[PDB]
Each structure stands twice: as C-alpha cells, then as structure tokens.
Write a protein that binds this DNA or RNA. Structure first.
Lengths: 143, 93, 173, 227, 60, 129
RNA sequence: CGGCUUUUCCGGAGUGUAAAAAGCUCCGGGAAUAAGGGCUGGGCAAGGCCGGUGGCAGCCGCCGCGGUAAUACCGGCGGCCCGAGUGGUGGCCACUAUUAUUGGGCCUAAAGCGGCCGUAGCCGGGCCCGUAAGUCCCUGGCGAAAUCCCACGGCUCAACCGUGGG
C-alpha cells in the first residue's frame, strides 16, 4: 500500500518507524555502538609503535602466486601482536629481529585485505624512527 | 614639504594637537629633530613645549602621516605626558 | 570560526576540457597559478549567486541589495551603465580577467609583454592615483582607469630609461 | 553557410526521390523542415533531411557517443560484431540518435549515423528557470521527464551560463540540441550508456507533449525548433 | 530575426497539439469537404468519435 | 472506505484526461469541491460545470477541454505563511508559475497567485497544471 | 648575443620600546640571486621509447601487470597534474533516492504474519447553526555578543577592523 503513516497528527509513528529501520543498516550501528574502537587493536590511533619478532612470507591468493614478505610485531601501547606487510624492493633485508617500528593501516577496502594479499591489514612506515621508503631507495641509512 | 590638516585644541588640558603630512618623494624617512625644527617655524611654538607623538610612512607611498602635540607650560608634560616620549624627543635624559 | 579559502577546487582535476580551457586562459594571460583563475571564477560565481538570490527575492531589502549589486558591478567597470539584473548572468571570466591590473596595464601599452607588466607591478614601477601597488591580480575599478601611470620615483618615469623607448616603439610597431 | 547550400544543391542533383516524401522536397514544394514533423509523415530516405538540413553534414554536428564490441557464441567461434551509438544534430533544436551494427568500425559508424539521420525530432526551448526568466531558448522551457529501460531522467530548467548539468552522454546529446543550461536528476543505472542516451532522447521528445497556455510562449520565449 | 511563429496543428477530438513524430492524420471533412480534420494517435487507437466543426457530422 | 472525496475526484479527472474522455461525473459532491473546481475554472483549464441533485449527495458534471497535464490533491494540508510559496511551488509545479496551487485562507479557497496578491497565507489543498 | 628593475642581501632615517626588540616603513650599494611532490594500462584518462627482473623480485583503492620481449615492477629518457606545497594513513559529510517526509522497495533478485478478531493509536460520509483551540494577517515585548550576507570607509590591495542595513 501507500507508504504510511502520513497523517498530520501522526509524526510519532513516523519517527519511530524511521529510527527502528535505521538499525537495519550497518555503518551507523557501528558508529553508535562504537564497535570498531572496542575491537580496534590500535584504539583509533593513526599509527602505532611496536617491536619486531619474526619475518614470514605469505602466498598471494590465486591466481596471483607470490611470496609477499611481512613481519610479526607486538605493539607497545597494549601488548597485542599483529602482522604487517613490508612494501619495497628488497625491503625485508633492512628489517631485523627486535626492531622498533611504526605501523599504520594498509588502505584496503574498509581498511581490510588489500587486493591479492589476504589477512594482512597494515604496513610499516618508520623503523627506529627512520622512514622505510627512503631506505628502500637507499637515500637514508638505518641506525 | 609639510602640509597640515588638523590643528585642534584640548583646553581642558591646554594642548594644541596637530595632524599633518610630510611629502618626501624619493628620499629616506625624516628624523624627529629635523621635522620638529621645521614644524616649530610656521606655527609659532616653543620647542620646549612641543612633543611629537608619531610619524608613520605608509607602504609604497611618499606622503607620511605625522601627529605632534604642543602644550602651554613645562609642567604639563611632567604631570600628564609620560617620561618616555620626552626621552625620545630628548626633553628628558 | 576559522578563516576560509576564497577559491574552490574543480570537482575533477583531470577532465580534459576544463584542463585545456584553463591552459588556454593561462597562456593568454600568464597567471602564476590556477589558484588565481579559480579565485576569479569564485568572484564571478558569488556575483552570480547574489544575482540569482535577488531575482528569487521579494522585499524592500531585496530591492536595496539589488541596487547595491548593480552599483558595485558598474563601479568596477564590468557592465554598461544601463545594465540590469538580467545581463550579469551572461558575464564571463574574461570580463573579470580584463579588469585585472596586469591586463589593464598591458593594454595601456606600458609593457611589451604582460609578463613584463607583471615584473613592473611587483617592482612597483607603476602607481595608481599616486599610490604604488604590487598585486597583478588586482581588479581595478572604473574611476581609476585613467590614473594608472609610471611610478614617479621609479626610473621608468624618466622617458629616457633604456626599456622605455623599446616599450614605445613596440606600442607603435 | 554557402558551403552547405551548395552541398544541398549537389545532393539534390545526385539523390533521386524514392518515397512519397521525395518529390515535394526535390521540387521545392517543401522547404521548411518542420513541414515534415507537423504533418508527421514517415522519413525513410536520409537524403531528404540533408537537403533541408545540410548542417547534418558537419563533422561537429555528428557525434559517436558509444562504441561496443558485442559477441555471439557459436560452435565454431565467437563471432564478434560492433554496435556503435552516434548522435547527429543541428545546433538549433533538431537532433537524431542512431545505432549501428557492423562488421567493421567504419560501416557500423556509417549505418548508425544514417539511422540517426532518420530519427530527427523537433524540440522546444525557452527560459522557465526560477531566477533567469530571460524568455530566451537558453534552456528547456519547463521540467521534463523521460523513461526507458531502467533510466528515468528529469531535466529541470536552469539559469543562463550555468553550464549543462548532466552526465557526459546527456552532455553531448543536449549540446547537439541547442540547449546549454539545465539541472539533471537521474534514477536507475547510468552506466548503460545506450539506455541513458535513449532516455534523454525520449525526454527531449516529451518536451513537446506538454500542453502550453498561449501566454506562456512569450512568458518563456518558447521557440519551436530553430531560433 | 523575424519571429517565425508557426501554427501547431491541434487534434479536434482531444484538442492536444500534435507532437512531432506521432502517427497522426489529417483530412478534409468527409461530409462537407472543407474542414481539415486532424486525428491524433491517441485519438486514433481508441477511436473516439470526432466532430466536424462546420456541418456537425460525427465520425469514428 | 472513503476518506477524502477531493483526492479521488482529482485522480478520476486526471485519469479521464489521459484517455481523453469528454464528460466526467464526480459522485461525492460537496461545497468545497464545487468551490475549488470553480477556482481553476476561473483560469480556464476546465470548461462549464454543473451540480445535479441525486437525493443523496448530488453529482458534479464537467466537460473537459484536455489542457491539464496533472491535477493532484495535497493531502496533508500543509499550512504556509505568505513568504514561503516558492518553497512549495518548486515541490509541485514544473516551472515558474506553471499552473496554480489551491490554498484555503481565512476568506476561503482560491488560487495561489491571487493569494500572493492579497498576501494571505493558509492551507495548501491541491495543485493542477 | 646586447641590454633592462634588483624579490632576498649590506648601510643609514623614522614607527618602535615607557626597555629594547618588533626588521614594519623611506633612501642608498646590489646579486638573475631560492623549487618541489606525485603520476604515467584502465575507474580516473593525464602522459612512450629503451636497459634490467622474469609471477623470483614487486606493483596495486578497484579492475589487474610480470611465469622470458611486462606500454602496468625496477633504472634512464621523455611526458601529465598541482605548486611552496605534493603523497600515505586514520575520523566525519557528499557520492547514496545504499535511510528514502520531499523520496526507497517487498511474484522471480533480502524483504506480507499461514488465516481471522480486536483494544490504544492513525486515518474517517454529506448539509445547517455557533465557537475560534489549531490555522492565517497586523501590531508590543523578547530570542545578547561573537560568527553569517551586502554597501561604504582604514590599514597598498586583500584577510582584518569600523559605520550602516539584513
């Protein structure tokens, strides 16, 4: 039938209906209940600092076959442990065990898996407060 | 050359206050002593009674605004006006 | 309250048509940044928005603001003296750009090249009403259009400055 | 301009009238083009329209909106075939839209342009916006709607020099219609370029459907076709 | 720019002006043979009876 | 059931116009329906009209000239002051002054342009173009 | 090639300081003396040659590139956008009529209760009489300032400030 109610003296049911069906969607529900920031390892932090533990390479999802390098880092703010992809040509050679590092989100869709590497969520920026990009380019030197 | 626009009189304090303009096209901004010795000429003022407040030369202009002030007696600036302006004009060490 | 930009970025910085029209207007006017052209279009858009609102307004205040709009746009020398609210909507960016100081002083034959005019502007060899300026993006008003002359203290005031005769012969030739 | 008059003359020489629309245009008994649409005959020779609208011959007045490489699967190979959509039109309120199958790009283009030539429709123009009201055909006279496939397009009058506010396909087709300022609202999927173009075409055709009171013509400077 | 305002034909049976590419028809009156009766596609398909203005004759 | 004669009558009128029928009857005849119908008749979209008693509620007969494109009823009786007419017109009229709106102010129901003239607001009722 | 002013830089003169400082403003010597970031297969369109790696290394928002010639990785060239800013990340509005009163749908794509009954609620036939609570117009008080729109004036112009009007 006609989308109802519409009576001049019926705004209550209108706003009730609207608010109820708002709950159907997901993003607004995620904002209000604060689900992301009560599941966030980084607590809404644009970057985090941590210590390196080990280096592992992962098999690119098919049909892409590749050994994407990455690291295991336990961060200092709370002590949780995560995986971080290492972009750069021969990047992994610079990174060593027991390294102070700086990590941020990878930029996949909804911050999720980025393309053909599933599971990873993050990339490294600075190691020992030294940006990795120039280290890849060799302009700067790791301490 | 120096061209005046305002001479007005606060008789409650006994000051003739003066707004004027200095036309100095192509030469550096004048100093206080020389403009003082100029102004004192065609207004018939005692230099000891006269204190120049400010001179301001606007950006990219050859005509600079200037405000000066002349009382009646020596006690008037010692009681009303503050020491530093006498210091700048040299009436006080 | 934070001071806001007075210019707006295009919705898509890699559309060919707008990019090349901008490029054309840049080589026809040699403005340092697209920022400046965007700003001028912003002024245009604000004038047009005011016009549209006023056309969509009824009230003594509406009429008064309409009069003010017409009076100002004429004062800037953008429209004929019998201009109405209708014709402003047909205004173009080139109308505004013509009113620029760089464009006006170049059309006054005081520079072989409008970039040479810009250099004179920044070097303050040019004066308006006996006051120096250094802003090539200035949209001069109508009633000062005859007062743009060489700075009296600049060497270019002397008719024997080595550039001046080249300016004059380029003007003639 | 004289180039197009001589073009009309030479095509008059070359083309031979075939249908019952051919003689009165060859004979000159029909010169105004709108005499075709008002009485609403059938147009079947392209050579008719360019006799009275040689402006169609212009490279700019013809546009290829879309090129597509459709496929047909067979036991013995995927037989490809190009489908190309092109819009032709004079810049003063007469446009046509055409589709061409083809085995090469050129033949598809030619057939599409010919079919567009066979699809000339007559529009109205004016100034019904809420601010401009300049009684000039700088925009559509009044809000109009057009529907085809999923796409529903509502075109709303705008003010002078606003630019033409529509997706690129609508941009080109409206540019070819002599209309340069309009607001647009789109429903349905606009990635189907063909459906979008045809819906815009249908809206423009719908423009003539609205009954108009006599005073409104001068209220908006309603122009029937050319200016 | 002489204003070439034209006289868009109007269907007698509905009074609606005829759109360009409609398949409407026109014809002298069948009874008094003077009136140029028009008939619009909508008026054609359902075929409501049309009235000649002059002789009063009615026709499907 | 029947909850407003006016909207049903206007819808019936528009539908008959789509098929181009010539004579139309509205069964639930009231004073208000007659007055509004007179109101747009003043502006020519409809020709002669009449009331015929039936001993129950009367019937309203109209002949149509087929110059209306849509005549709808604004059910939720929005009250509006003088100033905001352009806000509502954009919501219902295709173009500037294209047709009318029907407003019941303190003096009665009449056109919206005339309402602007007298400068008296009221309750939007229907629209037709 | 020949020449032209000297952005900045050195000196001096004023505002300046209640104390300088503030390098602001005027004059003089006076250099052609400061420029990057990202992208380069397509959505974006915005732009092609070569050396190398050969699905190893890597790139990549998404679609996707290299498993032996890669226009898509790396290096060079050349090019495209902006410009003293450009790039990455994270949060918010638009995009999205993917929250729908304007304005979303529910046979087949997720979406009608298995059916009927009915309370509160929502929406209700026509006409006459009276009220005027809602409804509309006029009018008093009141909704501070700061912020916002417009004209003019002061600061070279602007930003900023003032006067006036909204």
């Amino acid at each position: 039938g006609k989308k109802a109610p519409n009576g001049e003296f019926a705004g209550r049911k209108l706003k009730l209906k609207r608010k109820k069906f708002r709950w159907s969607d997901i993003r607004y529900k995620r904002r209000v209940l604060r689900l992301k920031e009560k599941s966030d390892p980084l607590e809404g932090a644009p970057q985090a600092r941590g210590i390196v533990l080990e280096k592992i390479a992962v098999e690119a999802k098919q049909p892409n076959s590749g050994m994407r390098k990455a690291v295991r880092v336990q961060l200092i703010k709370n002590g949780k442990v995560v995986t971080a992809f290492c972009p750069g040509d021969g990047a992994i050679k610079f990174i060593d065990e027991h390294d102070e590092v700086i990590i941020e989100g990878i930029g996949g869709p909804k911050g999720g898996s980025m393309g053909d590497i599933p599971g990873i969520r993050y990339k490294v920026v600075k190691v020992n407060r030294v940006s990795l990009k120039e280290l890849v380019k060799g302009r700067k030197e790791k301490p | 050359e120096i061209r005046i626009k305002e001479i007005k009189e606060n008789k409650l304090i006994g000051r003739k206050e003066i707004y004027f303009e200095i036309y100095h096209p192509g030469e550096p901004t004048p100093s206080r002593k020389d403009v003082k010795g100029k102004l004192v000429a065609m207004l018939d003022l005692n230099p000891e009674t006269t204190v120049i407040q400010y001179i301001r030369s606007y950006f990219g202009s050859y005509i600079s605004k200037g405000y000066a002030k002349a009382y009646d007696s020596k006690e008037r600036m010692l009681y009303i006006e503050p020491e530093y302006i006498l210091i700048r004009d040299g009436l006080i060490e | 309250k934070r001071q806001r930009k007075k210019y707006e970025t295009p919705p898509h910085p890699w559309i060919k048509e707008r990019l090349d029209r901008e490029r054309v207007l840049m080589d026809k006017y040699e403005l340092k940044n697209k920022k400046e052209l965007w700003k001028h279009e912003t002024q245009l858009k604000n004038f047009r928005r005011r016009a549209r609102r006023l056309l969509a307004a009824r009230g003594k205040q509406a009429e008064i603001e309409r009069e003010q709009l017409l009076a100002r746009l004429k004062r800037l020398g953008l429209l004929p003296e019998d201009a109405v609210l209708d014709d402003v909507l047909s205004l173009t960016i080139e109308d505004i750009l013509e009113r620029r100081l760089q464009t006006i002083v170049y059309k006054k034959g005081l520079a072989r090249t409008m970039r040479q005019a810009r250099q004179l502007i920044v070097h303050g060899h040019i004066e308006v009403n006996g006051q120096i300026i250094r802003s090539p993006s200035y949209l001069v008003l109508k009633e000062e259009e005859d007062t743009i002359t060489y700075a009296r203290t600049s060497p270019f005031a002397n008719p024997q400055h080595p550039e001046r005769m080249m300016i004059e012969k380029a003007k003639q030739g | 301009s004289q180039e197009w008059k001589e073009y009309a003359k030479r095509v008059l020489d070359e083309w031979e009238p075939k249908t019952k629309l051919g003689m009165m245009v060859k004979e000159g008994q029909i010169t105004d083009i709108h005499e075709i649409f008002r009485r609403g005959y059938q147009i079947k020779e392209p050579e008719i329209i360019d006799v009275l609208l040689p402006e169609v011959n212009a490279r700019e007045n013809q546009e290829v909106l879309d090129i597509a490489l459709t496929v047909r699967m067979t036991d013995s190979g995927r037989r490809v075939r190009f489908r190309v959509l092109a819009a032709v039109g004079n810049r003063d309120g007469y446009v046509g839209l055409g589709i061409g199958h083809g085995k090469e790009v050129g033949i598809a283009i030619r057939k599409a342009i010919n079919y567009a030539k066979l699809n000339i429709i007559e529009i109205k123009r004016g100034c019904g916006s809420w601010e401009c009201r300049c009684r000039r055909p700088h925009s559509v006279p009044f809000a109009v709607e057009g529907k085809e496939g999923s796409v529903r397009v509502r075109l709303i009058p705008g003010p002078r020099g606003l630019g033409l506010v529509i997706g690129d396909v609508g941009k080109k087709i409206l540019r070819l219609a002599g209309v340069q300022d309009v607001w647009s609202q789109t429903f349905g999927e606009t990635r189907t370029t063909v459906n979008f173009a045809k819906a815009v075409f249908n809206a423009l055709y719908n423009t003539n459907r609205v009954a108009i009171s006599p005073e409104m013509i001068e209220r908006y400077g309603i122009v029937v076709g050319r200016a | 720019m002489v204003e070439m305002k034209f006289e868009i034909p109007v269907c007698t049976s509905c009074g609606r002006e005829i759109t360009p590419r409609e398949h409407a028809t026109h014809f002298i009156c069948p009874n008094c043979g003077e009136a140029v009766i028009w008939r619009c596609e909508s008026c054609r398909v359902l075929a409501k009876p049309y009235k000649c203005p002059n002789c009063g004759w009615e026709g499907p | 059931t029947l909850l407003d004669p006016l909207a049903n009558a206007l819808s019936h009128i528009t539908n008959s116009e789509r098929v181009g029928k010539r004579e139309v009857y509205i069964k639930p005849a009231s004073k208000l329906i007659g007055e509004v119908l007179r109101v747009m008749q003043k502006y020519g979209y409809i020709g002669e009209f009449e009331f015929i008693d039936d001993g129950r509620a009367g019937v309203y007969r109209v002949q149509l000239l087929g110059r209306i494109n849509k005549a709808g009823a604004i059910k939720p009786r929005f009250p509006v002051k003088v100033s905001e007419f352009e806000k509502w017109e954009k919501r219902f009229l295709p173009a500037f002054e294209f047709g009318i709106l029907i407003v019941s102010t303190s003096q009665g129901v009449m056109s919206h342009k005339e309402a602007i003239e007298k400068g008296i607001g009221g309750r939007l009722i229907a629209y037709v173009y």
